[PDB]
Amino acid sequence: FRIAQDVVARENDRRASALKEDYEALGANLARRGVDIEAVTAKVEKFFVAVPSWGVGTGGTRFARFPGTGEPRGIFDKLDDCAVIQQLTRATPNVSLHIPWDKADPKELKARGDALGLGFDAMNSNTFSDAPGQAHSYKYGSLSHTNAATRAQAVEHNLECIEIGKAIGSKALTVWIGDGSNFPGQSNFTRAFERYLSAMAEIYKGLPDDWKLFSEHKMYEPAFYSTVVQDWGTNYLIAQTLGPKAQCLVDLGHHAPNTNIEMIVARLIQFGKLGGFHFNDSKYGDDDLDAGAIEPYRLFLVFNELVDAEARGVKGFHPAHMIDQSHNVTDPIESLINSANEIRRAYAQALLVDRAALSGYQEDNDALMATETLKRAYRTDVEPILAEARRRTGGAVDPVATYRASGYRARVAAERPASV
């Protein structure tokens, strides 16, 4: 236990009356709306989202990285911090690894995860940066590089990510590369895409029967003119061409300005190619900010589509969700905790939508009442639901508050010497 259980008990107990009071008042409100709070809380308790191992360390920009105290160094420190998030929120039982950043003895990794109450989600390859001793540089690309040997090296690396994953209980490989161009003419759009497809096919072959291969699109950065896997369009083409085990990941901040992202999610669901959604928020580009800190309604609308599919069924709908953020000015553990909270909030509110009435208003072209139908769910403060769900599953009523009272940050600060 990273956080002392008595601390959690103590903090949860001092707030129990306040929680009960809010949970009952909201229950009566929902009752009058033909909604059983219990059924909502039970689904909220089972909604999980994978945490990225690299998310608990302080992020930065090309201009600077301002570390806080107790920076986790290495996958072990990182797992230890991810455990706090899971313990207090009970919404992140699985961690997503990144190779080579988190390379370590498989057996040791698994053992550490099991001891912490954490599992492992999709593996993440890295061919957007060069590692020491690497024979071929990825400066000009990897899987789509013009040099065959470089592509081969990129493919072999992704294969190794699978072998590591197979050994720790993982069932998928996410592939996000920087590949693209910064100048017009630098790359031949079609030929680079062909090279990419060809290299991905080889990785696809190394896929066990129960594994999936996720490709992630991004409009720009690190490439500033063109990017091989630039949008969900190219992303769909990829998934369809690779096969059944290949699907597309939709990362909120990876789209052009004003893009209707929730429609992209619905389009992928329909054609059974939505592998999963990567949560974060943005205002300008791929800001990788805390989920819901900028546009919480947008987040709700995305979840509205997920819930529609989750309820109405849909062939091939088994999303692998993950938070992908950079925490440059906050305590990384606190931001991930509140972001996971935000993700469950949007989920919970999506569950309140009256699907029948909505469908009626859409059929009648009653736009005002259709949008109002969503707003009724969205405007609902489901915090008591999120907190109770946490309380019933070993979590903290108020995660951040509990995390602060535990002095966890100061503790790892004493154990982890900083640069200065």
The DSSP code sequence of 323-346 is E---BSSS-HHHHHHHHHHHHHHH
Site for Zn ion in 252-291 (CB under 5 A): 278, 286
- 221 has binding-site annotation: no
Q: Which residues pair with 172 in a beta bridge?
A: 212
Cβ 317 to a copy of itself shortest distance, Å: 12
Residue with the two structure tokens 């939505």: 274
Q: Residue 139: helix, strand or coil by DSSP?
A: coil
Helix segments in 90-231, DSSP class H:
106-116, 148-168, 189-205
Pick 130 or 163: Cβ nearer a copy of itself: 130
User: For the window 209-248, what string marks contact with Zn ion as x by the rule CB under 5 A?
Assistant: ----------------------------------------
CA torsion 403→404→407→410, rounded to 10°? 110
Would you state the structure tokens that stand for residue 65, as one six-digit string?
Answer: 């990285």
Q: Residues with Cβ < 8 Å from 381, sequence gap 6 or more?
A: 26
Pick 209 or 284: Cβ nearer a copy of itself: 284
- 342 has binding-site annotation: no
> Which residue of 251, 305, 324, 388 would you call a contact of a copy of itself, by CB under 8 A?
305
Q: Which does 234 bind (CB under 5 to 8 A by kind): Zn ion, a copy of itself, none?
A: a copy of itself
Q: Which residues pair with 249 in a beta bridge?
A: 216, 276
Q: Which does 278 bind (CB under 5 to 8 A by kind): Zn ion, a copy of itself, none?
A: Zn ion
> Which residue of 39, 107, 225, 356 would you call a contact of a copy of itself, by CB under 8 A?
225
Work out whether 73 is an interface residue with a copy of itself (CB under 8 A).
no
Can you tell me the distance from the alpha carbon of 89 to that of 394, in angstroms, rounded to the nearest whole number? 8
Q: Residue 192: helix, strand or coil by DSSP?
A: helix
Pick 6 or 257: Cβ nearer a copy of itself: 257
Longest dimension (CA), the chain: 66
Strand order in the sheet with 119-120: 51-52, 94-96, 119-120
User: For the window 240-279, what string marks contact with a copy of itself as x by the rule CB under 8 A?
Assistant: ---------------xxxxxx-xxx-xx-xxx--------
Counting every residue written for the chain, the total comes to 420
Mark the segment that binds a copy of itself (CB under 8 A) among 2-10, 43-51, 99-107, 225-233: 225-233
Burial class (CB in 10 A: 0-12, 13-18, 19+), 196: buried
Work out whether 393 is an interface residue with a copy of itself (CB under 8 A).
no
Q: Residue 278: helix, strand or coil by DSSP?
A: strand
Q: Residues with Cβ < 8 Å from 295, sequence gap 6 or more?
A: 281, 283
Mark the segment that binds a copy of itself (CB under 8 A) among 40-48, 58-66, 165-173, 405-413: 58-66
**AA identity, residue 220:** Y
Count the Cβ atoms, other than its own, within 10 Å of residue 163. 11
> Which residue of 45, 80, 308, 324 would you call a contact of Zn ion, by CB under 5 A?
324
Would you state the structure tokens that stand for residue 313, as one six-digit string?
Answer: 């069924």
> Which residue of 71, 81, 251, 342 would you call a contact of Zn ion, by CB under 5 A?
251
- 288 has binding-site annotation: yes
For residue 50, the 8-state DSSP code is B
- 286 has binding-site annotation: yes
User: For the window 352-381, what string marks contact with a copy of itself as x by the rule CB under 8 A?
Assistant: ------xx-xxxxx-xxxxxxxx---xxxx
Can you tell me the distance from the alpha carbon of 122 to that of 396, in angstroms, rounded to the nearest whole number? 27
> Which residue of 29, 69, 198, 393 would you call a contact of a copy of itself, by CB under 8 A?
29
For residue 143, the 8-state DSSP code is T
Count the Cβ atoms, other than its own, within 10 Å of residue 258. 6
Cβ 91 to a copy of itself shortest distance, Å: 17
> Which residue of 144, 187, 215, 406 would you call a contact of a copy of itself, by CB under 8 A?
187
Mark the segment that binds a copy of itself (CB under 8 A) among 49-57, 83-91, 181-189, 389-397: 181-189
Q: Which does 276 bind (CB under 5 to 8 A by kind): a copy of itself, Zn ion, none?
A: none
Q: Which residues are annotated as a binding site for Cu(2+)?
A: 216, 251, 254, 278, 286, 288, 324
Q: Which residues are annotated as a binding site for Zn(2+)?
A: 216, 251, 254, 278, 286, 288, 324
Q: Which residues are annotated as a binding site?
A: 216, 251, 254, 278, 286, 288, 295, 324
